[PDB]
């Protein structure tokens, strides 16, 4: 409901896009599990995509941790100070790639 939430007016951070575009995503940190099944999609994205994604986006740092963890998550962090959480849990590689590409922009 629109009376339930807060609101904001349309805004750019730091008047972005005027002088130059500054891609706002700063760090991206994955946590997968080498052993467990729910991380399957998260694994392949790390093998095939992460390289080319890092080449394409020089600005964002990408941290990747395999750890004994049951729900694979990706934590986006912004130049804004904003932090956004996602579960990549039980998703295909095209689905991980797509999500990360949503976070990016």
């Amino acid at each position: 409901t629109a009376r339930g939430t807060a609101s904001r007016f349309l805004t750019s951070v730091l008047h972005n896009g005027l002088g130059r575009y500054v891609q706002q995503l700063q760090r991206l940190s994955f946590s997968l599990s080498r052993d467990a099944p729910s991380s399957r999609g998260a694994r392949e994205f790390v093998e095939r995509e992460v390289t080319d994604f890092a080449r394409r986006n020089p600005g964002v740092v990408i941290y990747v941790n395999p750890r004994p963890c049951c729900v694979p998550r990706v934590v986006a962090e912004y130049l804004n100070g904003a932090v956004r959480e996602e579960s990549i849990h039980c998703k295909s590689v095209e689905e991980i790639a797509a999500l990360v590409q949503k976070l990016a922009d």
């Binding site: 760090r27 020089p58 740092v61 941290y63």
Partner: protein
Amino acid sequence: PVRRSEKPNWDYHAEIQAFGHRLQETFSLDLLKTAFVNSCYIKSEEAKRQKLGID
């Protein structure tokens, strides 16, 4: 509020390199590393070096 440097994911060299890469500027990394160093950090570093007997 806690320093991102004290939180779980930190690589300072990667951050420094990235910083410059995202604004499309060329810094000798030496000069940029020089740039983020403050007198306060040095004074605290000397406090710790003196009180722990570290050279």
